[PDB]
Structure 1
Amino acid sequence: MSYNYVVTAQKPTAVNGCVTGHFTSAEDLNLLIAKNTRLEIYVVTAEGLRPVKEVGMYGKIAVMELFRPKGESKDLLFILTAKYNACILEYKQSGESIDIITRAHGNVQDRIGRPSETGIIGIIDPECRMIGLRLYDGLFKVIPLDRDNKELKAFNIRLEELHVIDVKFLYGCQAPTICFVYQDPQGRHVKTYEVSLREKEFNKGPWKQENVEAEASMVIAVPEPFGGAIIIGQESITYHNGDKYLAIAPPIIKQSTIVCHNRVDPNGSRYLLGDMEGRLFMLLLEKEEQMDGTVTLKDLRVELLGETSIAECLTYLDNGVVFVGSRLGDSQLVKLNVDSNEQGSYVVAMETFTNLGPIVDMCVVDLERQGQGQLVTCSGAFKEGSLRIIRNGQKLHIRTVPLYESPRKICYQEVSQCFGVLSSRIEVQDTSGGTTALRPSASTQALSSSVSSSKLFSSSTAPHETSFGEEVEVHNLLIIDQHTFEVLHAHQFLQNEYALSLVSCKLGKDPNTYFIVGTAMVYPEEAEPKQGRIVVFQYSDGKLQTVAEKEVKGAVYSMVEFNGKLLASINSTVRLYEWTTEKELRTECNHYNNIMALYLKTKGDFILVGDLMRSVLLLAYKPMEGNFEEIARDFNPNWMSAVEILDDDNFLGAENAFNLFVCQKDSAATTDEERQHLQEVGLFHLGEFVNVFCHGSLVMQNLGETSTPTQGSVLFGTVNGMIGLVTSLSESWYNLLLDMQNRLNKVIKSVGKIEHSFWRSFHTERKTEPATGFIDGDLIESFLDISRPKMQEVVANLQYDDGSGMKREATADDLIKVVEELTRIH
């Protein structure tokens, strides 16, 4: 068996959702911000936000909504986790003591159902009579909000329309009514139903179905003064309400897909819209009152306000202040002014909240030379693209290098006192026949520049037609100074060439240190690329000079230096190259038993290969034979997102289902087959999507540091900005920390009353297993924050093992010291 420890070094930073309301008091204006597994509660002031409380939940927050049922003084909070843990929460404050009440809770998962493409949707009735959930195709689940439903029991209503895009409860209806956009072979439609709690079925809805734009994406529930709904698409915005129909199709919105909506004026006169390029729009609803006294909707208008960060959620707060919740970039507070500034913008940034964004890649390098270690991460996407240099100081110090284009991979080259960064920027087919970039960015603002003239694929004779307005990715290699972080050089790769891998190393008997990049020819027609290049560059005297090129018949997904040789993965093949005295790469040996070799890692002569669906293989190079040999494979099927080698026998992997596992050689040499079976001895549900695993420690490393119980250091980056550290334990230390978890779980009160053991259970759509071989470091580190009565309750009847004293009782002061040493790792 294996024993390992996981700790959350930096908490998730990306904003996954955000709401406003009156949650802490019926009087205050609240802003609740949801980051993965984290809920942040703020109170709105005239200058900004006053933080009041933060809680963690044992689950990914999927639905977050505030409502106020008749009889309550203040808003209640509904949250549903991605594992279908539902709960209703209340804020309660006793002077200085702030706690969160679990008013109702339960798990709403169905035994049989197909998870929907557009994900979990959760909505609540304007009269707060019920909670609507769209969890599975063809089914609508209703949790009625009666006082007695403390377990959140629910029923399903058969829904004929299998493929639903979005749904909202409507305002102004005689009965609870849902309005939704759905897709069938004939296109997309908008349709209504009435929900009867008494009959437990749908009844005919208030207004007829209408055919809508093919890419109709979002439903906006218009308030009572107008009623009805607005449907947002790629090209058009339409209003529907019985006999009334409006459509505005302003050319400005066609340019970028609109992804987020919020209401500015409670009556619905003004709404806010944002798009993937970061533009913020004001949607205006023009009113017309008839002599009857009835208010109708006259027309719709769209006005461009300015630019914000690409935002997952918008929420207007008060006065001119809007909170911009960003997942791909830093989140923001911005003020909307009535008068434009001299550039034509009505939007002026107030505050900027650090979001490590998607961490596509990262490297740990001791830039200071202090032995501490700094983490430079490839963070953000598109305009929000950034390099983030992170050091420990008690908070983490983070520096931001704006790139305005997406970063893909990073590697450090000490000989050149610089980093290499792979980037992709978006250009659009323009009337010249070429392409034009939407904004300047790192690859265009380099001091010196170069464009590849390779003729390897120049024979072509393969047609790829271009239509005006289509997007293309232009991938580049950035040479960036390690002190100034100035783009010294940018090399533009070939048209339709995407950069997938990058390494810096010396090869063979060649004393020069090179940047080596692996690329693939990407054509929309091909599901899998069949052409690729391996390129050797040298960065010298401010210029990047190409040394050699190798044509491969596929995509160079990953590369890694192997004892003076270049190890590369091309599609289904793993190939090792030698570097000749003629400065040209030469094929040596190949391995083909992989469906798609996405990730590579080396230790000694051992190679860990990550397949798309076949988990990991322990390959080895036998020098005497000059060929590869399969040592062992994990036959259990998994989808890999990142792998890492812990030691010669333990191997760590990340699953696309937000899961982590550790494989070990069975080490029983009785049969050859036993050695060949990698047994999964560790299972854990991280809750984050790990993209990169990197050996190193951010915390200061000194020869004098008290040797911690933990051994080894692997840092991992995730899509939501979370950075974590994995380390190993001795059998004795694991059992102690494991036994303590079980004691802590009985003592610590969970938000929503979610069982910790369930949360960490390995979970795919098909399987759920109890966690094994892993210590939730965060749970262990929470011992220091529980009250003294609880601490002593935890240590009761707790015995140590395999130590100086075989059985040794624990006291509350003893464990406080142990955990405090465990907090020094991060």
Structure 2
Amino acid sequence: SYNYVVTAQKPTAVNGCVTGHFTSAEDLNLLIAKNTRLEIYVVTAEGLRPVKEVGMYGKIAVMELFRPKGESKDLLFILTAKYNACILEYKQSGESIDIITRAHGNVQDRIGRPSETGIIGIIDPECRMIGLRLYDGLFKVIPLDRDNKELKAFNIRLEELHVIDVKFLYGCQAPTICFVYQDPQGRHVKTYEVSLREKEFNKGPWKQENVEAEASMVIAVPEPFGGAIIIGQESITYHNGDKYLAIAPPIIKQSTIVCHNRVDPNGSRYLLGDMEGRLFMLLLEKEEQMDGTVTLKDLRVELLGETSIAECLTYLDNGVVFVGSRLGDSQLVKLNVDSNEQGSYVVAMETFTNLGPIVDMCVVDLERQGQGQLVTCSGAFKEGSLRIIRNGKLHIRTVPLYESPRKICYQEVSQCFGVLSSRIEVQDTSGGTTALRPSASTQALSSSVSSSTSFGEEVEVHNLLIIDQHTFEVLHAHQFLQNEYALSLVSCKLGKDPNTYFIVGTAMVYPEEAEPKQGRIVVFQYSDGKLQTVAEKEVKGAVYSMVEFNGKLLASINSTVRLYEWTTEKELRTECNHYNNIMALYLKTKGDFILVGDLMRSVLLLAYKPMEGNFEEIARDFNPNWMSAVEILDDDNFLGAENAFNLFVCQKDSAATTDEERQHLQEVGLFHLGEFVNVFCHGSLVMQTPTQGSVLFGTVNGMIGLVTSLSESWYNLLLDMQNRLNKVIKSVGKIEHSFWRSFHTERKTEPATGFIDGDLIESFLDISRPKMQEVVANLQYADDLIKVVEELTRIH
């Protein structure tokens, strides 16, 4: 296949952030990791000043700072998803700003299943050990000694098996580890002491105790308070020696706490952020000063305000807070004591764009056939929105919906986007549902409701919104039947009817069942400023994905894949069925070929035979693994994204003469992408060569990527260039390119094949002139290669 992958729009969803003295002993820095890009900003009164943006050959899963004795600035500890651990230092000489790896190494155990609660990384208050919980029933201790250049780790055993949370505790003679763990008897909090000399565990200060049935997070209260705070969903507790205090304020009951930080150095004040956005402020009762020892006396929880959903929170200096949201725009907010405008102390200050999580993406030529603009359904929950991206640096503009969008399609003869959306209502005492917010699905100029069990439960109400393409005001909104779920949406004309219809597939789900036993397909017509419904036909299953095909409408009704003709009566009619042994989540039609896929990597390549009227299989591939999105590149190749953030290309052997080879897909190329690709779409952002075709893809973390096709000679030249660059470019963390891009699953690995890492090749233009001479010494292709790289750069 010999394909080419580049990063059009870099990731923006914040996967964690830290505050500390990293650039200099006097500058307070915020470090944000999106997926692989570590961005280093200096905290300034007016806001943030972006100082550095460094890529990493790995997904940053653990980020921390530590200041070992005898140093000047805090070093950054990064762990990659593939378990590359590195320690990095910030050094700038004149105008040069470089990152130096003090130590690097892979710390994955040969045998072990990764923990279901994910990677937990922690550092001692006194910087004498670095603890990780990567594999269950184990604790990986890395002695942070000046002589441990290679990060030589050693394991310690853990009697327990379901450590929920784990963190160190301040003010201990020897390093302590306090952790909340699960057991068939309940949840308990225990302290262990790490004897490095003996490389073992020892009895902890305060023994096991019962805690709430939903304890989730441990917070290490620093000295002189000491001890630990356990924050469950119902009660906040504090344990320290012989002092045990607790509360269960009524405020937190609605939503759990899924983040926190320390606002003061002495730990007398703490922040908390729920799933729904509320920003609570836990205050300790320091007043208990009796004889130089301070002890708790209260745990008031006060509500500050409603901020964007917080996947992380940091308190910058002088009453400014960075709310890093992974599923919505990130915020810089202010905790003004004397503003109290509406009872909330939070006043928005600045908004940073978080394009993802993309759930659907449409390329449309809004202007007069010029560029291909992107319309993407970004965000989820309250912070959902439509995003328009133009290439004329990219320019991103927002259309908030105040609800979750699902899919996007574009109609030209109506100049309208169709967007499926969901909002969450609460069951009322009247037996009905009340909306929590004034969502866009309710604030339409014109509205319709389709015509055809406890208290406090959350019920999802689904709508289709017709949104104008000039002002982005909701021209219409249509609500579906109760307990219905819209799954697929297509804007496509059928048969001989001149007008362009909307089609939506719906499955009715009830909480007591697993596989929807009933669904429907609705054909809407948008004209006269109203959303008339023109046809409806019920299928006995769920409709997952839909596309038009040669003037006919396909559908995935359960495992069945079905063809619909659009008669003169504006009625769907069934032409020819096909029964599969997999459920056809993904459909992609090109010419006469259909590509059908499910979550388990099952790829089928059906074909259409108009002479007889049935579909006949052509090629098949089963290899158990999780597949997120699957796309058709050319008449033969098929590109998909699968588990562990991987890209695979399946090619069908046309030269094969035997059936055993004609009915199988020979995997050609693999590429560990570092990104959970969610949507594939044809299109390009540059005016309409080494590249043929173009497939954009949108991911969860918020990056757009472009995959194209390179020619044989170009591919070989670019691969030799790739191997020649990987010997001069000193990547941060001493992480080898071959390892990062090596296809990865929890079972097995291969080196990359069939893809060229566009980022590395494009990095050629930025290297210093002397380096280029060494890069390509014996090729007989120095300026010609500049021509190559620039021509490639002119694609995205």
TM-score band by shorter chain is over 0.9
1:781 to 747, 762, 767: 762
Are 1:635 and 1:678, in contact at CA under 8 Å, matched by a contact in 2? Answer: no
Matched residues in 2 for 1:17 and 1:245: separation?
Answer: 31
**What per-residue deviation string (whole Å, max 9, x for no partner) do you get for residues 162-181 of structure 1?**
11111111111121111111
**What per-residue deviation string (whole Å, max 9, x for no partner) do you get for residues 515-541 of structure 1?**
100111122222222211111111121
3-state secondary structure, aligned to 2:296:
strand
**Greater Cα shift, 116-125 or 520-529:** 520-529
**What per-residue deviation string (whole Å, max 9, x for no partner) do you get for residues 87-137 of structure 1?**
111111111111001000100001111211111010000010001101011
The ranges of structure 1 where at least 4 consecutive aligned residues each deviate by more than 3 angstroms after the TM superposition are: none
Per-residue deviation, 1:593? 2.3
Per-residue deviation, 1:203? 1.0
**What per-residue deviation string (whole Å, max 9, x for no partner) do you get for residues 29-64 of structure 1?**
111111101000111111111221111010000110
**Greater Cα shift, 49-58 or 717-726:** 49-58
Matched residues in 1 for 2:292 and 2:597: separation?
Answer: 68
Which residue in 2 is equivalent to 1:455? Answer: none
**What per-residue deviation string (whole Å, max 9, x for no partner) do you get for residues 707-757 of structure 1?**
x31111111000011000000011000001110000000110011100001
Per-residue deviation, 1:341? 3.1
Are 1:597 and 1:612, in contact at CA under 8 Å, matched by a contact in 2? Answer: no
Per-residue deviation, 1:601? 0.5
Are 2:582 and 2:602, in contact at CA under 8 Å, matched by a contact in 1? Answer: no
Q: 1:638 to 1:293 in 2, by over 3 A?
A: closer
Per-residue deviation, 1:4? 0.4
Matched residues in 2 for 1:237 and 1:511: separation?
Answer: 64
Matched residues in 2 for 1:529 and 1:240: separation?
Answer: 48
Are 2:643 and 2:745, in contact at CA under 8 Å, matched by a contact in 1? Answer: no
Matched residues in 1 for 2:549 and 2:581: separation?
Answer: 19
Are 2:314 and 2:322, in contact at CA under 8 Å, matched by a contact in 1? Answer: yes
**What per-residue deviation string (whole Å, max 9, x for no partner) do you get for residues 342-396 of structure 1?**
3112111111111102000010000012421100000001111010000012x10
Which residue in 2 is equivalent to 1:239? Answer: 238
**What per-residue deviation string (whole Å, max 9, x for no partner) do you get for residues 543-576 of structure 1?**
1122222212221110000111111112211111
Are 1:498 and 1:522, in contact at CA under 8 Å, matched by a contact in 2? Answer: yes
**What per-residue deviation string (whole Å, max 9, x for no partner) do you get for residues 274-306 of structure 1?**
111111111111113343221101110111111
**Greater Cα shift, 25-34 or 791-800:** 791-800
Are 1:208 and 1:242, in contact at CA under 8 Å, matched by a contact in 2? Answer: no
Unmatched runs of 5 consecutive residues or more in structure 2 = none
Unmatched runs of 5 consecutive residues or more in structure 1 = 452-464, 702-707, 801-811
Per-residue deviation, 1:614? 3.6
Q: Which residues of 2 match residues 459-498 of structure 1 at below 5 A? A: 466-498=453-485
**Greater Cα shift, 465-474 or 426-435:** 465-474
Are 1:760 and 1:771, in contact at CA under 8 Å, matched by a contact in 2? Answer: yes
Q: 1:126 to 1:345 in 2, by over 3 A?
A: same
Matched residues in 2 for 1:226 and 1:468: separation?
Answer: 42
Are 2:600 and 2:623, in contact at CA under 8 Å, matched by a contact in 1? Answer: no
Per-residue deviation, 1:638? 3.0
Are 1:634 and 1:680, in contact at CA under 8 Å, matched by a contact in 2? Answer: no
Matched residues in 2 for 1:512 and 1:399: separation?
Answer: 30
3-state secondary structure, aligned to 2:279:
strand
Q: Which residues of 2 match residues 583-662 of structure 1 at below 5 A? A: 583-662=570-649
Matched residues in 2 for 1:137 and 1:420: separation?
Answer: 46
3-state secondary structure, aligned to 2:22:
coil
Per-residue deviation, 1:514? 1.1
Q: 1:692 to 1:594 in 2, by over 3 A?
A: farther
Matched residues in 2 for 1:495 and 1:363: separation?
Answer: 29
Are 1:179 and 1:191, in contact at CA under 8 Å, matched by a contact in 2? Answer: yes
Are 1:18 and 1:33, in contact at CA under 8 Å, matched by a contact in 2? Answer: yes
Q: Calculate the aligned-residue CA RMSD, in Å.
A: 1.4
Are 1:327 and 1:720, in contact at CA under 8 Å, matched by a contact in 2? Answer: yes
Are 2:535 and 2:571, in contact at CA under 8 Å, matched by a contact in 1? Answer: yes
Matched residues in 1 for 2:176 and 2:539: separation?
Answer: 58
Per-residue deviation, 1:670? 1.4
**What per-residue deviation string (whole Å, max 9, x for no partner) do you get for residues 125-164 of structure 1?**
0010001101011111100111111111111111111111
Matched residues in 2 for 1:594 and 1:602: separation?
Answer: 20
Q: Which residues of 2 match residues 36-185 of structure 1 at below 5 A? A: 36-185=35-184
**Greater Cα shift, 487-496 or 791-800:** 791-800
Matched residues in 1 for 2:762 and 2:139: separation?
Answer: 40
Per-residue deviation, 1:794? 0.5
**Greater Cα shift, 49-58 or 210-219:** 210-219
Are 2:181 and 2:188, in contact at CA under 8 Å, matched by a contact in 1? Answer: yes
Are 1:392 and 1:700, in contact at CA under 8 Å, matched by a contact in 2? Answer: no
Matched residues in 1 for 2:139 and 2:552: separation?
Answer: 58
Are 2:310 and 2:323, in contact at CA under 8 Å, matched by a contact in 1? Answer: yes
Matched residues in 1 for 2:459 and 2:256: separation?
Answer: 16
Which residue in 1 is equivalent to 2:792? Answer: 822
Matched residues in 1 for 2:748 and 2:582: separation?
Answer: 23
**Greater Cα shift, 600-609 or 287-296:** 287-296
Matched residues in 2 for 1:429 and 1:441: separation?
Answer: 17
3-state secondary structure, aligned to 1:23:
strand
**What per-residue deviation string (whole Å, max 9, x for no partner) do you get for residues 316-352 of structure 1?**
0101111111110011111110123331121111111
Which residue in 2 is equivalent to 1:744? Answer: 725
Matched residues in 2 for 1:85 and 1:410: separation?
Answer: 38
Matched residues in 2 for 1:400 and 1:385: separation?
Answer: 10
Are 2:521 and 2:539, in contact at CA under 8 Å, matched by a contact in 1? Answer: yes
3-state secondary structure, aligned to 2:130:
strand
Per-residue deviation, 1:467? 2.2
**What per-residue deviation string (whole Å, max 9, x for no partner) do you get for residues 250-269 of structure 1?**
12111122211010011111
Matched residues in 2 for 1:69 and 1:677: separation?
Answer: 57
Per-residue deviation, 1:657? 1.9
3-state secondary structure, aligned to 1:416:
coil
Matched residues in 1 for 2:223 and 2:514: separation?
Answer: 49
Matched residues in 2 for 1:189 and 1:627: separation?
Answer: 61
Are 1:448 and 1:490, in contact at CA under 8 Å, matched by a contact in 2? Answer: yes
Are 1:610 and 1:643, in contact at CA under 8 Å, matched by a contact in 2? Answer: yes
Are 2:170 and 2:221, in contact at CA under 8 Å, matched by a contact in 1? Answer: yes
Matched residues in 2 for 1:290 and 1:167: separation?
Answer: 29
**Greater Cα shift, 104-113 or 198-207:** 198-207
Are 2:739 and 2:751, in contact at CA under 8 Å, matched by a contact in 1? Answer: yes
Q: Percent identity?
A: 100
Are 1:615 and 1:639, in contact at CA under 8 Å, matched by a contact in 2? Answer: no
Are 1:412 and 1:419, in contact at CA under 8 Å, matched by a contact in 2? Answer: yes
Per-residue deviation, 1:700? 2.5
Per-residue deviation, 1:595? 1.9
Matched residues in 2 for 1:142 and 1:311: separation?
Answer: 30
3-state secondary structure, aligned to 1:757:
helix
Matched residues in 2 for 1:729 and 1:505: separation?
Answer: 32
3-state secondary structure, aligned to 1:149:
coil
**Greater Cα shift, 635-644 or 513-522:** 635-644
Are 1:264 and 1:271, in contact at CA under 8 Å, matched by a contact in 2? Answer: yes
Matched residues in 1 for 2:733 and 2:179: separation?
Answer: 29
Aligned residues: 794
- TM-score, normalised on structure 2? 0.98
- TM-score, normalised on structure 1? 0.95
Are 1:668 and 1:674, in contact at CA under 8 Å, matched by a contact in 2? Answer: no
**What per-residue deviation string (whole Å, max 9, x for no partner) do you get for residues 564-597 of structure 1?**
1111112211111112222222222222224221
Are 1:606 and 1:620, in contact at CA under 8 Å, matched by a contact in 2? Answer: yes
